């Protein structure tokens, strides 16, 4: 009874028939290697996007950035790696600056919570304040 | 070669004794760095490369043929180190090496 260890953490007479021989001399084009390192790269799963999702306390993961000009950051971002992915200075494929007016796209952030208000005080701060305005003390 | 040019001598003369030609490596042994262990930390410089064998395994296809964008970026890190260093020291054992006498290099 092998045991498989755990990805993660969680709670707690001749022989010899003829024929076969190794003679043929035979190269592949195009060839086996740059084959298998280009494969390799297009099977790679897709980057989790949790931005402004709640996290094990409640509070919305992510930073205080405003809707519209998160998306915007995380264009030149993109074409930045393309950049560098070519090996070159600019990449001739962008995801920003195009001729298209993308003013009112929208992308995910920290900024807002489930219940569509504003994050300037972490949630769980807000339930403490909350709760502890209806305490009462030991008479003297 | 400089084995095959020794062993010759006509009239007695010895033409191209051994002791009369300077290999391309003894400017680079002279410094106390040798060169070629100098140019062995460029991965140190380059970015997202943490060794000299993967920095080999980067820059070189698998058909051990440079890539040209690759291959220039080293060069950009190359030229410094053979342009400041080598140079001197090069002039220095050129310098001394006439005044001391003719010489194959």
């Given amino acids: 009874m092998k045991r498989i260890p755990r990805k993660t953490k969680g709670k707690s007479p001749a022989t010899t028939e003829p024929g076969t021989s190794n003679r043929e001399q035979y190269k592949a084009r195009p060839g086996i290697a740059s084959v298998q390192r280009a494969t390799e790269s297009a099977e790679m799963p897709m980057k989790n996007n949790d931005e402004g999702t709640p996290d094990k306390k409640g509070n919305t993961k992510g930073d205080l950035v405003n809707e519209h000009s998160e998306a915007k950051d995380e264009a030149d971002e993109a074409t930045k790696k393309q950049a560098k992915d070519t090996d070159k200075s600019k990449a001739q494929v962008t995801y920003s600056d195009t001729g298209i007016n993308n003013a009112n796209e929208l992308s995910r952030s920290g900024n807002v919570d489930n219940e569509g208000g504003s994050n300037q005080k972490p949630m769980s701060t807000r339930i403490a304040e909350a709760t502890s305005a209806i305490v009462s003390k030991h008479p003297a | 070669i400089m084995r095959v040019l020794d062993s010759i001598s006509i009239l007695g003369i010895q033409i191209m004794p051994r002791a009369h030609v300077v290999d391309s ?43 040209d964008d690759r291959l220039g970026q080293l060069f950009q890190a190359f030229l410094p180190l053979a342009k400041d260093l080598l140079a001197p020291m090069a002039r220095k054992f050129y310098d001394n090496s006439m005044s001391e006498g003719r010489l194959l290099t």
């Fill in chain 2, 25 to 67: 490596d003894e400017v680079g042994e002279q410094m106390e760095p040798t060169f070629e262990q100098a140019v062995m930390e460029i991965y140190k410089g380059i970015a997202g490369v943490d060794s000299l064998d993967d920095l080999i395994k980067w820059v070189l296809n698998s058909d051990l043929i440079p890539h």
